[PDB]
Design an enzyme around this catalytic site. Structure first.
Site, PDB file in Angstrom:
ATOM      1  N   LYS A   1       0.841  -1.185   0.000  1.00  8.92           N
ATOM      2  CA  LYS A   1       0.000   0.000   0.000  1.00  8.92           C
ATOM      3  C   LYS A   1       0.885   1.247   0.000  1.00  8.92           C
ATOM      4  O   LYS A   1       0.576   2.235  -0.673  1.00  8.92           O
ATOM      5  CB  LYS A   1      -0.940   0.008   1.216  1.00  8.92           C
ATOM      6  CG  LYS A   1      -1.943   1.147   1.186  1.00  8.92           C
ATOM      7  CD  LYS A   1      -2.961   1.052   2.302  1.00  8.92           C
ATOM      8  CE  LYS A   1      -4.048   2.111   2.135  1.00  8.92           C
ATOM      9  NZ  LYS A   1      -5.147   2.000   3.135  1.00  8.92           N
TER      10      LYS A   1
ATOM     11  N   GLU B   1       8.156  31.440   0.464  1.00 15.18           N
ATOM     12  CA  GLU B   1       7.738  30.233  -0.220  1.00 15.18           C
ATOM     13  C   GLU B   1       6.331  29.893   0.268  1.00 15.18           C
ATOM     14  O   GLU B   1       5.945  30.233   1.393  1.00 15.18           O
ATOM     15  CB  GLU B   1       8.720  29.096   0.081  1.00 15.18           C
ATOM     16  CG  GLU B   1      10.084  29.289  -0.565  1.00 15.18           C
ATOM     17  CD  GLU B   1      10.014  29.264  -2.094  1.00 15.18           C
ATOM     18  OE1 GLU B   1       9.809  28.165  -2.658  1.00 15.18           O
ATOM     19  OE2 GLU B   1      10.157  30.340  -2.729  1.00 15.18           O
TER      20      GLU B   1
HETATM   21  C1  LIG Z   1      12.048  28.802   2.547  1.00 13.63           C
HETATM   22  C2  LIG Z   1      11.982  30.020   3.484  1.00 13.63           C
HETATM   23  C3  LIG Z   1      11.470  29.671   4.896  1.00 13.63           C
HETATM   24  C4  LIG Z   1      11.395  28.364   5.344  1.00 13.63           C
HETATM   25  C5  LIG Z   1      10.951  28.081   6.658  1.00 13.63           C
HETATM   26  C6  LIG Z   1      10.590  29.124   7.509  1.00 13.63           C
HETATM   27  O1  LIG Z   1      10.165  28.847   8.779  1.00 13.63           O
HETATM   28  C7  LIG Z   1      10.968  29.367   9.753  1.00 13.63           C
HETATM   29  C8  LIG Z   1      12.265  28.891   9.964  1.00 13.63           C
HETATM   30  C9  LIG Z   1      13.061  29.427  10.963  1.00 13.63           C
HETATM   31  C10 LIG Z   1      12.570  30.444  11.765  1.00 13.63           C
HETATM   32  C11 LIG Z   1      11.282  30.924  11.568  1.00 13.63           C
HETATM   33  C12 LIG Z   1      10.489  30.387  10.568  1.00 13.63           C
HETATM   34  C13 LIG Z   1      10.664  30.427   7.041  1.00 13.63           C
HETATM   35  C14 LIG Z   1      11.100  30.699   5.754  1.00 13.63           C
HETATM   36  O2  LIG Z   1      13.318  30.603   3.657  1.00 13.63           O
HETATM   37  C15 LIG Z   1      13.292  31.858   3.172  1.00 13.63           C
HETATM   38  O3  LIG Z   1      14.260  32.601   3.179  1.00 13.63           O
HETATM   39  N1  LIG Z   1      12.073  32.180   2.682  1.00 13.63           N
HETATM   40  N2  LIG Z   1      11.741  33.422   2.096  1.00 13.63           N
HETATM   41  C16 LIG Z   1      11.175  34.495   2.805  1.00 13.63           C
HETATM   42  C17 LIG Z   1      10.760  35.638   2.090  1.00 13.63           C
HETATM   43  C18 LIG Z   1      10.192  36.722   2.770  1.00 13.63           C
HETATM   44  C19 LIG Z   1      10.030  36.685   4.165  1.00 13.63           C
HETATM   45  C20 LIG Z   1      10.441  35.556   4.890  1.00 13.63           C
HETATM   46  C21 LIG Z   1      11.014  34.456   4.218  1.00 13.63           C
HETATM   47  C22 LIG Z   1      11.207  31.149   2.818  1.00 13.63           C
HETATM   48  O4  LIG Z   1      10.063  31.135   2.481  1.00 13.63           O
END
Ligand SMILES: C[C@@]1(c2ccc(Oc3ccccc3)cc2)OC(=O)N(Nc2ccccc2)C1=O
Ligand SMILES: CCCCCCCC/C=C\CCCCCCCC(=O)OC[C@H](COP(=O)(O)OCCN)OC(=O)CCCCCCC/C=C\CCCCCCCC
Ligand SMILES: CCCCCCCC/C=C\CCCCCCCC(=O)OC[C@H](COP(=O)(O)OCCN)OC(=O)CCCCCCC/C=C\CCCCCCCC
Ligand code: HEC
Ligand code: HEM
Ligand code: HEM
Ligand code: HEM
Ligand SMILES: CCCCCCCCO[C@@H]1O[C@H](CO)[C@@H](O)[C@H](O)[C@H]1O
Ligand SMILES: CCCCCCCCO[C@@H]1O[C@H](CO)[C@@H](O)[C@H](O)[C@H]1O
Ligand SMILES: CCCCCCCCO[C@@H]1O[C@H](CO)[C@@H](O)[C@H](O)[C@H]1O
Ligand SMILES: CCCCCCCCO[C@@H]1O[C@H](CO)[C@@H](O)[C@H](O)[C@H]1O
Ligand code: FES
Lengths: 59, 67, 78, 49, 241, 49, 101, 379, 55, 54
Positions: H227, H271
């Site tokens: 599955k 993203e």
């Molecule tokens: C992929 C991404 C991402 C992935 C996970 C996240 O989640 C967190 C991770 C650590 C701390 C806080 C949140 C946040 C952004 O990394 C990144 O630079 N971005 N881009 C982005 C653009 C504008 C504002 C904020 C972020 C993401 O989306």
């Protein structure tokens, strides 16, 4: 009786089943690639360098 | 001589109801804005409504005539 | 290693057939699809609704945003 | 008592060739297995590829 | 304020999921880049060898490369010298650095075009609309000196003067060099420049789809086959009573 | 930044007691027509236009 | 007024565990209190509960439900465990209260 | 022991987790995402290594080393697409895995759940540092926005940020350390996955009906191995279709432009898998307040097991909760959408609404309705 | 193949870094297997005779 | 560290010369590799001598 013949000769013994998969893949690949490439080039007739080449080839 | 199908088609498309109406609204805006000496107004919007309708029309025919 | 000490079960009989004696996907029309419909039906008014609402809020908010980009003729009348 | 126990009817599921209770099921066994294993052997070929 | 006009979607012959690029169009587009755009635009990521077996023959590619003088060295005296290009060389930069570039374009910086269609929303649709969409500003809008009105460019005032016009060049394949014809070709070329793997990617996608259809089916059967045991299984509760 | 004389005035006219960061426009400069800053938004670091 | 009965009968039917042949009590999450109560159930009541559950899991895997004629009826649902469970909780509370005392 | 599958100290382990493992006979497709998540992990690591072998962590070479990879490395472009899109596939699967958990009350397995949240947090950090590597405009500014979030912490805030940066702003030491972290973290994810499955086997899986399945268990093989392999190929089609026919559907074109310290993109948008959280961050017009809302938006998951009032484990027989459940899902869609729009009317208000209801559904409505449903059952 | 070219060069270096980063973790993992097999019997001792009487 | 022939050597130099305690960490890593082998050799020796290999 293909299913029957196939079962006895190919699928019954695990050993033969393995050889059948090996050759099967070999055959499949050759055919699948060629057919796939054909279908692709056919949908793009006259656009590939393969199609254009003759115009500038002058070796 | 030489003629760009883009010119041909653009002229044809400007005959369209949508374009004609848009064009009409633009000329009206242009006229009043051009006639005043102290107005913030601009005719970008009408120009866009026009260009938008015309060009959308152009897109459908244009490549049929290009090589 | 859990099989053998899972539960205390009594008086239950079960019957099964080898996978080679039966059909892999039987009664598609008489049973499968009728049930897919049953299942779909029993859930559409649970699921769909909030999503429909989200869609609306989306349509509105989008249209409203673009509407506020338009010119207000009443700003140049005089 | 167990004498009163009988296997239900699996006709709504049986493959066509073993639907008839008065026919040997061995005669259609190789075909029934040949087919199922054919699917498997083919999936193995697509996977190897 | 944030008023913007978005380009329409042109039916490029390479837009379809199985649609390769029109190489005749890419070849032409190259000439447009070479004879027009390269005067101010760099294309750092493409080398003359990339042309071979794509738009040009090896002999041609070599010629194209030799037309350029490239700097090399240091030699024995530790001196830099010039030499004729090799197919392994990348397309020549019009300027030594952005400072010089701006300096030769009224403070404006013409971007490198290697990934331009992917670095702009709208891709070729946007590059095409910008190239053929110049016009006079609408009433109430004045473009500062040096800039040109273009409804497709954000802000609408671009520092690039209309780069192409009818017969600004002559396709050696005889195609009628009209402004739109030229834009359409160079745009196609730009698509290729950005994703040289474009074609191969699509041929793979085709196979991916076929193998996937097949394999998904066979696995579906096998899962059903093994599970039939439980799916058709019956049971009863016979307490002693 | 080089501020016009018009600008240098509009900055002299600011209710300080009613500002987030209670600061007078003359506590940030040494010469009125010259205002030097670090163009980074004190929020999450973007660059102010 | 009989408003509950209206509501409780609607809910029961809305819930739907009766489509699998399960009693309300058959669906309780087996926390500590429930586990204890189950051990106090008479043999037959226990074996019966087991069949209903196994049967329902078989239905769940098959993605079928029982024919409408076999669905348990709101007023025929047996609260077979509730009495036990209540005693169990009561006893527990007694110990708890007492162990603070 | 008569058969090796059980005596051997290593096979014994494979047998007890993938062959003789007792599994409920009725778990649905919603129980397929565990294995899919495992495969993303193995897939991501494998493609990541392959990319790392041509990557160069230095601001002057990052962007072009990736370009070099896609343009010169045999199938480099393919491997990059698979990695970039695999990250999305990873989030799609983690979100559905989580949804299944909340719906079926899988969170009553507290340790499996809690580590589950650790896994999510770790995957987030991984995605973040990984996203910064190509060093485009979006990589740079996102890295700027995200890292500056921590400056909101009082007192130690500025100090922590500059520390994390290795300087006064996101720069080369940030990039090199981010590469190392990006290389390391995936392996912590793999390790913690073992802890996750270890806690899980203490009880085995839960099932859609939320009632003991001890009366009807079946060997993991071949029922779920088959599955699971099926579920793999089903999800693998969209993945490959996307990656092979629409490589850039999910990415910001802005990241095709070398990072520029002096010019911030007009519309900085994260993203897709971070949008809903971004939306929440913006709902509170106060720096610190917005950060806390963001932190709480994810850490709220640690609270779920304590807001369970229902006398039943799943929501299968709880129609009122089911509605409340899809409202929450829709609420998340709205937040996602709001997170991709500019901070302006009507978005601003719509946003604060969705934000406010998100926490309201989880902290008040769910436990409240669960209690209400208990009474309607006469409990 | 290993070189990624015609001699030890940059692609050798970048792939070597990645390998160097990775392998230590394989070492850590295999260590667990090492100690796992070991515990099947526990340690041996200098006299080479059973120590079950004195653990 | 920076894996690129034009920057490898100098990034290590940068590490030992600019990174707080970078030099110390590098020494511990380089010499740790040796202690690692000294220990593995003695571990093997013990193994062979006491028949741990059984
Ligand atoms: C992929 C991404 C991402 C992935 C996970 C996240 O989640 C967190 C991770 C650590 C701390 C806080 C949140 C946040 C952004 O990394 C990144 O630079 N971005 N881009 C982005 C653009 C504008 C504002 C904020 C972020 C993401 O989306
Ligand atoms: C040209 C290419 C050359 C190919 C070279 C590769 C050679 C591989 C051949 C190995 C031999 C295989 C034979 C296996 C025999 C074992 C067996 O019993 O069959 C497998 C057995 C079936 O059991 P039965 O139906 O009961 O058969 C009993 C008949 N006596 O188990 C299976 O179903 C396994 C096959 C399904 C494969 C699942 C994979 C699907 C996933 C898709 C993703 C795609 C792949 C991408 C790979 C990426 C990895 C880096
Ligand atoms: C987080 C980031 C948000 C990103 C956007 C979210 C993605 C939205 C896409 C929609 C997902 C498709 C879901 C549609 C499923 C429709 C369906 O079948 O629903 C009814 C069906 C009925 O099942 P039973 O009660 O067992 O009855 C069977 C017989 N008695 O319910 C289910 O399938 C179970 C629910 C599991 C799906 C949850 C997935 C939703 C995903 C979003 C993330 C949410 C969680 C985060 C919380 C914080
Ligand atoms: C005389 C130099 C010159 C020529 C020749 C030229 N460009 Fe440009 N190009 C520029 C400049 C300068 C800009 C900067 C515009 C700005 O940012 O204000 C620019 C910008 C652009 C942009 C888009 C910038 C954006 O922000 O969207 C594209 C695409 C472009 N050029 C394409 C072309 C193509 C294709 C050609 C050849 C057909 C071409 N250009 C020829 C000067 C030139
Ligand atoms: C790197 C991420 C993760 C991986 C690889 C992973 C893997 C798994 C696997 C393989 C299973 C068993 C099969 C299944 O039921 O799906 C599982 C179950 C489970 N996981 Fe995860 N998981 C991950 C993240 C999470 C998250 C984010 C949560 C919760 C916030 C979570 C909570 C659970 C729970 C509670 C179950 C129990 C399933 C049941 O009800 O039977 N997991 N996970
Ligand atoms: C949890 C698994 C992983 C996730 C979620 C993940 C995610 C990502 C993301 C978001 C990117 C940016 C893609 C882009 O360019 O748009 C990235 C880049 C990268 N990842 Fe990973 N990754 C994972 C594991 C790995 C591993 C194990 C390695 C290396 C041993 C690695 C090495 C790289 C490299 C070198 C890049 C830069 C090249 C590029 O941008 O394409 N990743 N990763
Ligand atoms: C990364 C390398 C290694 C690590 C971390 C490691 C670790 C360990 C540990 C912690 C022990 C238990 C304590 C002791 O008796 O020393 C052990 C025992 C042992 N190791 Fe290793 N070991 C390593 C390499 C090796 C090598 C290279 C061999 C043989 C070629 C080996 C053979 C053994 C054996 C046979 C024992 C049994 C000791 C006894 O006689 O009781 N180990 N190892
Ligand atoms: C010694 C063996 C040499 C074999 C040369 C391998 C050449 C690979 O050729 C490949 O063919 C594909 C199908 O046309 C194209 O899509 C790829 O872009 C191309 O690189
Ligand atoms: C389940 C999905 C299976 C994917 C199988 C598709 C195999 C990809 O096939 C690829 O096609 C390219 C274009 O001709 C070739 O250049 C590659 O050498 C070939 O491996
Ligand atoms: C091979 C696939 C492994 C998946 C990881 C599941 C965890 O962990 C558990 O530790 C016990 C003691 O060592 C073993 O007996 C069990 O089999 C094992 O599952
Ligand atoms: C903390 C590290 C301890 C060494 C790992 C031994 C684990 C295998 O040990 C087995 O479980 C017993
Ligand atoms: S407004 Fe948030 S970074 Fe400037």
């Amino acid at each position: 009786a293909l299913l029957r013949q196939a079962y006895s000769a190919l699928f019954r013994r695990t050993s033969t089943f393995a050889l059948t998969v090996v050759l099967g893949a070999v055959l499949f690949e050759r055919a699948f690639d060629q057919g796939a490439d054909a279908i692709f080039e056919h949908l793009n007739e006259g656009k590939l360098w393969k199609h254009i080449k003759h115009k500038y080839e002058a070796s | 001589e030489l003629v760009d199908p883009l010119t041909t088609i653009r002229e044809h498309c400007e005959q369209t109801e949508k374009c004609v109406k848009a064009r009409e609204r633009l000329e009206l805006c242009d006229a009043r804005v051009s006639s005043r000496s102290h107005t913030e107004e601009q005719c970008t919007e009408e120009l866009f409504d026009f260009l938008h309708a015309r060009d959308h029309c152009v897109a459908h025919k244009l490549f049929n005539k290009l090589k | 290693i859990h099989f053998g000490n899972l539960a205390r079960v009594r008086h239950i009989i079960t019957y099964s057939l080898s996978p080679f004696e039966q059909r892999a996907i039987p009664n598609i029309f008489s049973d499968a699809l009728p049930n897919v419909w049953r299942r779909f039906s029993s859930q559409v008014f649970k699921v769909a609704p909030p999503f429909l609402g989200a869609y609306l809020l989306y349509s509105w908010g989008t249209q409203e945003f673009e509407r506020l980009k338009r010119k207000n003729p009443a700003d140049y009348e005089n | 008592v167990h004498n009163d126990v009988t296997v239900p009817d699996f006709s709504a599921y049986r493959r066509e060739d073993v639907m008839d209770a008065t026919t040997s099921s061995q005669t259609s066994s190789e075909d029934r297995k040949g087919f199922s294993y054919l699917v498997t052997a083919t999936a193995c070929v697509a996977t190897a590829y | 304020g944030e008023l913007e006009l978005h380009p329409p979607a042109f039916p490029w012959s390479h837009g379809g999921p199985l649609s390769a690029l029109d190489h005749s169009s890419v070849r032409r587009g190259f000439q447009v880049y070479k004879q027009v755009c390269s005067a101010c635009h760099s294309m750092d990521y493409v080398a003359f060898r990339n042309l071979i077996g794509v738009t040009h023959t090896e002999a041609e590619a070599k010629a194209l490369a030799e037309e350029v003088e490239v700097q090399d060295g240091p030699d024995e005296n530790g001196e830099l010298f010039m030499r004729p290009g090799k197919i392994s060389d990348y397309f020549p930069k019009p300027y030594p650095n952005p400072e010089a570039a701006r300096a030769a374009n009224n403070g404006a910086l013409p971007p490198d075009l290697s990934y331009i269609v992917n670095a702009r929303h709208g891709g070729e649709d946007y590059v095409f609309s910008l190239l053929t969409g110049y016009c006079d500003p609408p009433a109430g809008v004045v473009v500062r000196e040096g800039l040109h009105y273009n409804p497709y460019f954000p802000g609408q005032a671009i520092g690039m003067a209309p780069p192409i016009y009818n017969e600004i060049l002559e396709y050696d394949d005889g195609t009628p060099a009209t402004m739109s014809q030229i834009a359409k070709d160079v745009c196609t070329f730009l698509r290729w420049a950005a994703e040289p793997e474009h074609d191969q990617r699509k041929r793979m996608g085709l196979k991916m789809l076929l193998i996937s259809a097949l394999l998904t089916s066979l696995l579906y059967y096998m899962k059903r086959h093994k599970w039939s045991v439980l799916k058709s299984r019956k049971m009863a509760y016979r307490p002693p009573k | 930044r080089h501020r016009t004389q018009a600008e240098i005035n509009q900055e002299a006219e600011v209710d300080v007691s009613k500002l987030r960061d209670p600061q007078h426009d003359l506590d940030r400069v040494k010469k009125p027509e010259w205002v030097i800053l670090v163009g980074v938004c004190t929020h999450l670091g973007c660059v102010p236009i | 007024g009989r408003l509950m009965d209206r509501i409780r009968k609607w809910y029961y039917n809305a819930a739907g565990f009766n489509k699998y042949g399960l009693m309300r009590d058959d669906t309780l999450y087996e926390d500590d209190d429930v586990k204890e109560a189950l051990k106090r159930l008479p043999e037959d009541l226990y074996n019966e509960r087991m069949f209903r559950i196994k049967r329902a899991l078989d239905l769940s895997l098959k993605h079928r439900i029982l024919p409408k004629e076999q669905w348990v009826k709101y007023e025929e649902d047996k609260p077979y465990l509730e009495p036990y469970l209540k005693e169990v909780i009561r006893e527990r509370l007694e110990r708890e209260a007492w162990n603070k005392k | 022991a008569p058969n090796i599958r059980k005596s051997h100290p290593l096979l014994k382990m494979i047998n007890n987790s993938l062959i003789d493992l007792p599994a409920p006979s009725n778990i649905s497709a919603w129980w397929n995402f565990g294995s899919l998540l495992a495969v993303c992990l193995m897939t991501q690591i494998l493609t990541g290594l392959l990319l790392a072998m041509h990557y160069t962590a230095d601001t002057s070479l990052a962007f072009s080393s990736v370009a070099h990879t896609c343009r010169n490395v045999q199938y480099g472009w393919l491997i990059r697409n698979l990695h970039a899109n695999g990250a999305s596939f990873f989030f799609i699967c983690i979100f559905l895995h989580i949804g299944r958990g909340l719906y079926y009350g899988s969170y009553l397995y507290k340790e499996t759940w809690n580590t589950g949240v650790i896994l999510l947090l770790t995957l987030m950090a991984t995605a973040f540092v990984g996203y910064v590597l190509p060093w485009g405009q979006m990589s740079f500014w996102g890295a700027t926005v995200i890292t500056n979030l921590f400056s909101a912490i009082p007192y130690i805030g500025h100090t922590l940020v500059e520390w994390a940066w290795g300087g006064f702003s996101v720069d080369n030491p940030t990039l090199t350390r981010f590469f190392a972290l990006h290389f390391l973290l995936p392996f912590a994810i793999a390790g913690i996955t073992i802890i996750h499955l270890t806690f899980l086997h203490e009880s085995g899986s839960n099932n859609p009906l939320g009632i003991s399945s001890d009366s009807d268990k079946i060997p993991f093989h071949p029922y779920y191995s088959f599955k699971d392999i099926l579920g793999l190929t089903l999800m693998l089609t969209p993945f490959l279709t996307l990656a092979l026919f629409s490589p850039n559907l999910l990415g910001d074109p802005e990241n095709f432009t070398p990072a520029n310290p002096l010019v911030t993109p007009p519309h900085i948008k994260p993203e897709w898998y971070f949008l809903f959280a971004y939306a929440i961050l913006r709902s509170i017009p106060n720096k610190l307040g917005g950060v806390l809302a963001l932190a709480a938006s994810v850490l709220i998951l640690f609270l779920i097991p304590f807001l369970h009032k229902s006398k039943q484990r799943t929501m299968t027989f709880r129609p009122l909760s089911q509605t409340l459940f899809w409202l929450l899902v829709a609420n998340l869609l709205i937040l996602t959408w709001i997170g991709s729009q500019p901070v302006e009317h009507p978005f601003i208000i719509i946003g604060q609404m969705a934000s406010l209801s998100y926490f309201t559904i989880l902290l008040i409505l769910f436990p409240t309705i669960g209690t209400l449903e208990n009474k309607m059952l006469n409990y």
